[PDB]
């Protein structure tokens, strides 16, 4: 039926995970047709049982069956690349920590202690827990780096970064965004603020160990906050934007860049942000409200089309 297979939606994620996490998908590069019997003899995977997985991947539209062989669909070519953001996504999506967080989601809706389903499961908030877990941190930081890399060319196209002198990326992670921006926009001061136990090292990048809940460093004319606010509540989001306003002068600009809530696209990510952070994916209207409460003004709004989600580009200045 439609209901029982909807209940069994997890099986689709788990099937893809088995195919990608093992590295079996990396044998399907450049849309080649793979003989499963030969792949079985080479990789030492069970032929009969992997053939049944491939049949389910064909049903999902991940594989295509022709000439008694299988190729990745045009869309699913990314699964052949273990460096792709999709490879890191599935590795996190149904990992034990995420799964155990989802199992506390129901109970978390009845609590008023400000503890996420993740924290209820693991005993710390997401980012504080990642400090002690290499698997979660490395794979998450990798995912953020890959999606940062994808939007760079689009972001440089719609806004002039050359007019600016000193640029700070707040919660910039490994600092991929500014590293790629600096290669095309030379002769600027580049800084990246995040939570570092050991400062990253990159040519002409000033890596800052800071806390955007406490303070943002002043004396930059361009600030960037990309995919941060949907990890935070309304009050924490206002506190962050308030710290920007206190750091910014009249000439300063803040580029608030976020995966934006649009009715056409799935609410699934909005729920994931609730489970992991007690966060939420916000519309343009909700982002504008929080900015106004912090004493910031919207001077420019654009929509950036990415494969996986639409993005809201919001240029903020002090009132």
Ligand X SMILES: Nc1ncnc2c1ncn2[C@@H]1O[C@H](CSCC[C@H](N)C(=O)O)[C@@H](O)[C@H]1O
Ligand Y SMILES: COc1cc(OC)c2c(c1)C(=O)c1cccc(O)c1C2=O
The residues that touch ligand X, with contacts defined as CB under 6 A, are 127, 144, 147-148, 171-173, 194-195, 210-213, 226-228, 231
Q: How far is CA 130 from the centre of its chain?
A: 15
| Nearest distance, CB of residue 59 and its own copies, angstroms | 5
Chain residues 275-304 in contact with its own copies, contact rule CB under 8 A: 275, 278, 280
Judge whether 230 counts as a catalytic residue.
yes
User: In 3D, which of 34, 135, 131, 126 has the Cα closest to residue 79?
Assistant: 34
The nearer residue to ligand Y, 151 or 291, going by C-beta atoms, is: 151
Which listed option, ligand X, its own copies, Cl ion, none, makes contact with residue 199 (CB within 5 to 8 Å by class)?
none
Measured CA to CA, the distance from residue 290 to residue 95 in angstroms comes to 33
| 97, 122, 164, 230: the active-site residue | 230
206 binds Cl ion, rule: CB under 5 A: yes
> Could you tell me where the DSSP H helices lie in 171-279?
176-184, 234-247, 268-277
Which residues is 94 bridged to in the sheet? Answer: none
Measured CA to CA, the distance from residue 175 to residue 224 in angstroms comes to 11
> Could you tell me where the DSSP H helices lie in the chain?
2-7, 10-21, 36-43, 47-60, 85-93, 96-102, 105-108, 117-122, 126-130, 134-158, 176-184, 234-247, 268-277, 284-293
User: Which among 12-20, 63-71, 151-159, 182-190 is the span making contact with its own copies, rule CB under 8 A?
Assistant: 12-20
- Pair 223, 212: CB distance under 8 Å: no
Which listed option, its own copies, ligand Y, Cl ion, none, makes contact with residue 227 (CB within 5 to 8 Å by class)?
ligand Y
The nearer residue to its own copies, 114 or 219, going by C-beta atoms, is: 114
119 binds its own copies, rule: CB under 8 A: no
Q: Quick one: CA torsion of 261, 264, 269, 275, rounded to 10 degrees? A: 80
| Nearest distance, CB of residue 195 and ligand Y, angstroms | 13
| Nearest distance, CB of residue 98 and ligand Y, angstroms | 8
Start-to-end C-alpha separation, the chain? 56
89 binds its own copies, rule: CB under 8 A: yes
| Nearest distance, CB of residue 230 and its own copies, angstroms | 12
Which listed option, Cl ion, ligand Y, ligand X, none, makes contact with residue 206 (CB within 5 to 8 Å by class)?
Cl ion
110 binds its own copies, rule: CB under 8 A: yes
Tokens of 64: 């295509």
266 binds its own copies, rule: CB under 8 A: yes
Which listed option, its own copies, ligand Y, Cl ion, none, makes contact with residue 220 (CB within 5 to 8 Å by class)?
none
User: Which among 3-11, 136-144, 196-204, 243-251 is the span making contact with its own copies, rule CB under 8 A?
Assistant: 3-11
Chain residues 59-78 in contact with its own copies, contact rule CB under 8 A: 59-62, 75-76, 78
Binding mask 134-173 for its own copies (x = CB under 8 A): ----------------------------------------
Which listed option, its own copies, ligand Y, ligand X, none, makes contact with residue 276 (CB within 5 to 8 Å by class)?
ligand Y
* Residue pointed to by tokens 């806004």: 159
Which strands sit side by side in the sheet containing 310-318, from one edge to the other? 206-209, 189-194, 166-170, 222-226, 253-259, 310-318, 296-305
CB burial readout 64-84, b (16+ within 10 A) else e: beeeebbbbbeebbbbbeeee
User: Which among 31-39, 250-258, 266-274, 295-303 is the span making contact with its own copies, rule CB under 8 A?
Assistant: 266-274
Which listed option, Cl ion, ligand Y, its own copies, none, makes contact with residue 152 (CB within 5 to 8 Å by class)?
none
**Among all residues, which ones are annotated catalytic?**
230
């Amino acid at each position: 039926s439609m209901l029982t297979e909807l209940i069994a939606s997890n099986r689709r994620s788990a099937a893809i995970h088995a195919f990608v996490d093992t590295g079996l998908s990396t044998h399907f590069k450049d849309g080649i047709y793979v003989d499963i019997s030969e792949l079985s003899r080479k990789s030492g995977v069970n032929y009969a049982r992997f053939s049944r997985l491939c049949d389910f991947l064909v049903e999902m539209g991940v594989l295509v069956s022709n000439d008694n062989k299988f190729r990745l669909s045009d869309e699913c070519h990314v699964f052949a690349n273990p460096e792709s953001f999709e490879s890191f996504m599935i590795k996190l999506e149904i990992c034990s920590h995420y799964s155990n967080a989802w199992l506390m989601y129901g109970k978390s809706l009845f609590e008023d202690d400000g503890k996420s389903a993740f924290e209820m499961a693991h005993g710390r908030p997401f980012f504080e827990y990642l400090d002690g877990n290499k698997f979660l941190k490395s794979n998450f930081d990798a995912l953020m780096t890959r999606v940062s890399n994808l939007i760079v060319e689009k972001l440089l196209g719609i806004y002039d970064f050359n007019q600016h002198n000193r640029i700070l990326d707040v919660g910039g992670g490994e600092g991929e965004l500014l590293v790629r921006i600096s290669e095309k926009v030379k002769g600027k001061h580049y800084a990246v603020l995040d939570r570092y136990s050991e400062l990253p090292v990159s040519d002409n990048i000033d890596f800052i160990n800071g806390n955007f809940l406490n303070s943002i460093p002043s004396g930059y004319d361009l600030y960037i906050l990309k995919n941060v606010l949907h990890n935070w509540s309304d009050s924490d989001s206002i506190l962050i934007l308030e710290n920007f306003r206190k750091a910014m002068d009249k000439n300063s600009s803040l580029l608030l860049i976020n995966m934006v809530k649009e009715p056409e696209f799935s609410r699934s990510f909005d729920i994931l942000m609730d489970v992991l952070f007690l966060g939420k994916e916000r519309s343009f209207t909700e982002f504008e409200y929080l900015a106004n409460q912090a004493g910031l003004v919207v001077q420019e709004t654009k929509v950036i089309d990415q494969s996986y989600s639409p993005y809201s580009f919001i240029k903020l200045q002090i009132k």
